[model samples]
Target: AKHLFTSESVSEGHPDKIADQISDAVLDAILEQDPKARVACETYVKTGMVLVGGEITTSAWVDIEEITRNTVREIGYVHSDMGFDANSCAVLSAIGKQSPDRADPLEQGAGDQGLMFGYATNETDVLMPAPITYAHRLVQRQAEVRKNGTLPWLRPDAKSQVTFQYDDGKIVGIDAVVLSTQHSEEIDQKSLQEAVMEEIIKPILPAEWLTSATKFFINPTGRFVIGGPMGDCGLTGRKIIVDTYGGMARHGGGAFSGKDPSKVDRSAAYAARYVAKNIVAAGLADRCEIQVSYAIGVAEPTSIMVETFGTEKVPSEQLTLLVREFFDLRPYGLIQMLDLLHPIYKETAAYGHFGREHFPWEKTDKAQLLRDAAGLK
Candidate 1:
């Protein structure tokens, strides 16, 4: 039976993503000052309070409160009437020094043990799946319009969902679209729906993809005057599916933000994306997904698996064997392999991470090399 598949994404001001951004910003600060710092910071935000908790081992001392406030302030949560003003919010820190026992193992070994997956496809120019690509674009456009004042009444918290019809394994067209956003009370539902369709949706989605059959649910719940941290509690790692593949591909369930590169979750995931993107770019596969797993203090990956879903010219096992020889999946090796210790994480917080071309891990510079190494004809 042919059916529609849907994926959704949220904006930066969404409470969960807000926490994700704050956590990653803290990681970036520590990494900037001391790349060798080991951090696992988690953040929670609600109402007028911000709480930061996690473990850290670094020589750098950062103002956690400042970072939290600054993240919120940048996301357009500065006004008191918005329910949670960034500058006026109370910031609490429950973060503690890294345990000597934990640090000892990580120092001599891998930071932690976890599984991660990286996926790519020729369905989109950026090698990401189409459903998620457009899903992210929907919310990204919402943010752009809101930030640019094109839609001044649009609030920071927004979400978008795209359902695509797949026929014979190819994306045929969009089946449905769901966009819900927070807004000021001044705007009525009728105006909000009209503005969203004409200004936000039409501008971002390609005209050809939108059919007469397309379904759009714009703010189905209606009035959203109370939003941001006030509407719902938000915590770090809550948006992992939105952060990565939008559930189109399998995940190892490791959250990226709030953790440093030394942790296999963040670094290995980047490495997997780098590898899978290169494979698809090299024409080795029309679609590619890789999974890499690691154990605490271990330098090498416990398992590295690759699935091309019958889109590869070569046999899957043969490609997997070649990947084992071509890529390095160790914790430190991944850091160097992807150049991950940078301040670039904040940019990845809102949008879907895999599809964007500008992100460092999305580059296909190694594709030709990998193809040549694999002896692909």
Candidate 2:
């Protein structure tokens, strides 16, 4: 049962990610003052400017321009030489109050109706799919090398894709790799490829995975001197595939950032991941996906289901019932269960969202509980 599975990630300088980060930063600022703030901030970026407009109902006062500018500056877009200077750029906001369709949130209903998916696998130490885990590491390393001067010629914008060769149920080796990074005009293809191979790829990829058959396409387009939003337009929620399971798991259409916990799109997805990860950690399943659906202004989910992809230790039906019994899928309940009101989402804008340990939903503290329930009892 050999198969090729691919997953990809973008650098912080990527156009879509630039917008995602800005929106989340604005959300974080508002949440600092009002944890119950209803925010749906949206941002778009292009040459010389960042425009943000969305329905936000918060009593918190924050300088939108300052948030936009500082966010841009931190992402390495300060100098006009790179084509988008934060100091010189324009940041226009047309944010307004949230609609009064159902204003009294004391009811704690779903802000919007949507379904969200969460997935976990034991393929890697992080319980993430191998392709995505390594794909993220590649770009994270790209960022590390650029800021640390190991690859001083590297620019801000970059992308990495990894394809793993899987046989039966396990990854056997790497099939292909693609790393396209923006760099200074001075570096030639020869030098860039050599340095990237030794400095970036060699150090990150496992030695056993790289075989004679593995194919690499680094800067294959020959030149990548121009990058970032200056040449491309960026909008929030465009990189949803990269945000969640890197296409390894099915995703509901809703986007995570720029939305409050009451939105259900963000919190339910985080909770689903928490449940799935704990299931895998409990040794109840090797691969797991949890789906929860909600309706606007409804506290309980319309449906909750689990899929083990034929790798379940117990019956899939039993696990689904367990999820309903142990975890609360309601909008208010999910927010309380995972402590989702914190101003911590700004960091999840880039890099895949589910794998990091710092995020509360990524914790496996409930694994032992799940093990006791499923195994001993």
Candidate 3:
């Protein structure tokens, strides 16, 4: 039966995202100094405190405490009453040298064994699934309004969910929209909801998608003044689904931030996006999703799979075979193919990863080549 499918996204100031941004900032700083640095850092935030722990192998030295506190402060976590003021909060670091066992394997073999997936579709202008694209805009709009002071009472932590109604395998309309955000206690619920609906939701979402039957839920949990690490304990890698397709496509369960690109989980995912997006742009399929799996120390992928969901004019199996011929899935090959060694990861931690422009992985530069290979005129 045709029904609604939902996907959700969180703002950058959200607790989990705070951790992600901080960890990625650390990675960027290290990579800037030493592109070959091997970093595996994790960040945790709570009321009045922040903790950073990870393994590092680099000749460069970084001030972890400064990076942690500054990252929080930059995210607008400065007020003491907010429970976790960036300047006053205690920053703890348990970071140590990289383990020889881990380093040995990474040097002689693959960084880590893992699977990653990439997806694309002509359903959205960005070539991403609809639910996640809109879901990210909702939360991103919240952050925009909050940061721009359009809504003085809107706090950092916020989330958005979009349920899209599908009929005959295509999105027909928006079934429901949900937004929950933290705000100053001085603001009344009615005022908060109105401001969010007008300034954030109304501006980003298309009016045509909203009908009288569409349901809207803003702050259903009630009384969200005490937020941002006070009510929730956030850790890295917890928001993998949010970071990617918002469950519109299958995931191999890998987190992007904190780790360097040498890790297949981060680099391979970029490579897959580059490949899938090119295929869709080449008109090989109206939509496409590619999956690649790897084993530790192995250069070649264990498996590479593709699904067009009956949207392809060509045989899906042939498309997969052509993809193997057109794209390189090996770890080092992927890194070189996508130019993954740059320090461009910090921005990807917050928004949905697939739809954004100016990202290296999102480029369709290989589309023409793929078209030629697919025998498309």
Candidates in order have lDDT scores of 0.84, 0.88, 0.84
- Residue 180, model 1: lDDT of 95
TM-score of each: 0.95, 0.96, 0.95
Cα lDDT for residue 161, candidate 3: 95
lDDT of 2 by residue, 26-143 (tens): 9999999989898999999998789998888877888999999999888888777677888999889999976334453334677678888999999988898888888889998998
Query: Model 2 misses residue 211 by how many Å?
Result: 0.6
Candidate 2: residue 364 lDDT (0-100) = 95
Reference-based TM-score, model 3? 0.95
Can you give the lDDT of residue 239 in candidate 3?
Answer: 88
Candidate 1 residues lying further than 4 Å off, grouped into runs, are: 98-108
Number of the candidate with higher lDDT, 1 or 2: 2
* Weakest 10 consecutive residues of candidate 1 by summed lDDT: 99-108
